[PDB]
Each structure stands twice: as C-alpha cells, then as structure tokens.
Amino acid sequence: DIHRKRMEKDLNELQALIEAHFENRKKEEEELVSLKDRIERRRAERAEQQRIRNEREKERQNR
Amino acid sequence: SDKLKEAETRAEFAERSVTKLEKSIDDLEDELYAQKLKYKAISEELDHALNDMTSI
C-alpha cells in the first residue's frame, strides 16, 4: 500500500516535470528580451560615446 | 588665472568621465562574470548528460 502510494506520487512528480520546465522557459524568454533590448542599448550607447569623444576632441584642440 | 581656470575645468570634466566609465566597467564586469559562471554550469551539465549516454 505504501509502495502503490509511492508509485502515484512519482506520477505526480512526473507530470510536474513540465511545470519545472515552465519557470525555466520564462527565465529563458526574459533573458531573450533583455539581450534583444541590450542590442539597441549598446548601439545607441556607442553612438552617444562617439559624440562624447567628439566633444572631447574639440575641447582638446580648443585648449 | 583665466587660462588656469579653463584648464582646471577641462581636467575636472575628464576626471568625472574617468569615474563614470569606471563605474560602467564595474557593472559590465559583474554581469559578464555571472554570465560565464552560469555558462560553465550549463556546459558541465550537458556534459553530465553525455556521461549518462555512456552509462546507458
């Protein structure tokens, strides 16, 4: 009886397997979207720092 | 005195830039290290599964 009860709980864990998958999949999708927005963030940051270094150069010759 | 003031202004600008870039580097550094920690974890675990293939 304890063994049959044990068998059923394993079955519970078995289907739970997919439930363990869900949190990992949401975390994966969060990493997805964060990296995708980091793409344009990096590009805009590169443009901004190029402008900043341009201002640095003009102030350099200005002194 | 005027020239000294202009040069001091430019130097302070540059130094604040230094500090801000250092902080940005810090944040990026921590994120990259954590990324590689979890990368090596998932790689080792894929290898462990392959070890499972060997046990089978």
From Swiss-Prot, chain A:
Phosphoprotein among keywords: yes
One GO molecular-function entry: tropomyosin binding
UniProt KW Acetylation keyword: yes
Tissue expression from the record: Heart. The fetal heart shows a greater expression in the atrium than in the ventricle, while the adult heart shows a greater expression in the ventricle than in the atrium. Isoform 6 predominates in normal adult heart. Isoforms 1, 7 and 8 are expressed in fetal heart. Isoform 7 is also expressed in failing adult heart.
Biased composition (Basic and acidic residues): 22-63
Role this protein plays: Troponin T is the tropomyosin-binding subunit of troponin, the thin filament regulatory complex which confers calcium-sensitivity to striated muscle actomyosin ATPase activity.
Name the record gives this protein: Troponin T, cardiac muscle
The organism of origin for this protein: Homo sapiens (Human)
Gene (name only): TNNT2
Swiss-Prot record, chain B:
Residue(s) carrying Phosphotyrosine: Y33
Residues in the signal sequence: none
Modification after translation (UniProt): Phosphorylated at Ser-55 by DAPK1 in response to oxidative stress and this phosphorylation enhances stress fiber formation in endothelial cells.
Modified residues (Phosphoserine): S24, S43, S55
Tissue-specific expression: Detected in primary breast cancer tissues but undetectable in normal breast tissues in Sudanese patients. Isoform 1 is expressed in adult and fetal skeletal muscle and cardiac tissues, with higher expression levels in the cardiac tissues. Isoform 10 is expressed in adult and fetal cardiac tissues, but not in skeletal muscle.
Cellular compartment(s): Cytoplasm, Cytoskeleton
Subunit structure: Homodimer. Heterodimer of an alpha (TPM1, TPM3 or TPM4) and a beta (TPM2) chain. Interacts with HRG (via the HRR domain); the interaction contributes to the antiangiogenic properties of the histidine/proline-rich region (HRR) of HRG. Interacts (via N-terminus) with LMOD2 (via N-terminus) and TMOD1 (via N-terminus).
Family: Belongs to the tropomyosin family.
Domain notes: The molecule is in a coiled coil structure that is formed by 2 polypeptide chains. The sequence exhibits a prominent seven-residues periodicity.
Annotated function: Binds to actin filaments in muscle and non-muscle cells. Plays a central role, in association with the troponin complex, in the calcium dependent regulation of vertebrate striated muscle contraction. Smooth muscle contraction is regulated by interaction with caldesmon. In non-muscle cells is implicated in stabilizing cytoskeleton actin filaments.
Disease: Cardiomyopathy, familial hypertrophic, 3: A hereditary heart disorder characterized by ventricular hypertrophy, which is usually asymmetric and often involves the interventricular septum. The symptoms include dyspnea, syncope, collapse, palpitations, and chest pain. They can be readily provoked by exercise. The disorder has inter- and intrafamilial variability ranging from benign to malignant forms with high risk of cardiac failure and sudden cardiac death.
Protein name per UniProt: Tropomyosin alpha-1 chain
Organism per entry: Homo sapiens (Human)
Gene: TPM1
Boundaries of the shown chain within the full protein: 229 to 284 of 284
